[PDB]
């Protein structure tokens, strides 16, 4: 079950709600940094989410 | 700030003192009437030492 998980805690000391699953790995690595940036897809019914941030 | 910044009250001790350059605190007091201070501060060794 490849099905991984990821748990925010943002900003305001205040973890989202719920987890939601790491999408995947990308093989990339940021010239600079050497930043592999994943990509996490998490559910926002509140819109307590707010992409962006 | 309030987007990047994140807060909370908490204490400290709003003066500090260093003693020989270690931290130190003053006490203050005195002998007992009757007593002389030598007698205190033979009791403050004392209850230094514990």
């Not at chain 1, 709600?17 to 990308?26: A, K, M």
């Not at chain 2, 009437?33 to 209850?47: C, D, N, R, V």
């Given at each position: 079950?490849?099905?991984a998980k990821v748990s925010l805690?943002?900003?305001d000391g205040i973890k989202f709600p719920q987890d939601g699953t790491?999408?995947?790995?990308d093989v990339t690595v940021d010239q600079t940094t050497g930043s592999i940036t994943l990509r996490a897809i998490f559910p926002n019914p509140d819109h307590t989410m707010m992409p962006g941030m | 700030f309030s987007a990047f910044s994140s807060s909370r009250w908490?204490?400290?001790s709003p003066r500090l003192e260093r003693y020989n350059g270690l931290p130190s605190m003053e006490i203050l007091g005195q002998a007992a009437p009757g007593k002389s201070t030598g007698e205190a501060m033979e009791l403050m060794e004392q209850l230094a030492s514990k």
């Amino acid at each position: 079950n490849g099905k991984a998980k990821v748990s925010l805690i943002t900003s305001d000391g205040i973890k989202f709600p719920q987890d939601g699953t790491l999408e995947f790995s990308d093989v990339t690595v940021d010239q600079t940094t050497g930043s592999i940036t994943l990509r996490a897809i998490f559910p926002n019914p509140d819109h307590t989410m707010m992409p962006g941030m | 700030f309030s987007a990047f910044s994140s807060s909370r009250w908490e204490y400290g001790s709003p003066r500090l003192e260093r003693y020989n350059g270690l931290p130190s605190m003053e006490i203050l007091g005195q002998a007992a009437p009757g007593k002389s201070t030598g007698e205190a501060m033979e009791l403050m060794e004392q209850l230094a030492s514990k």
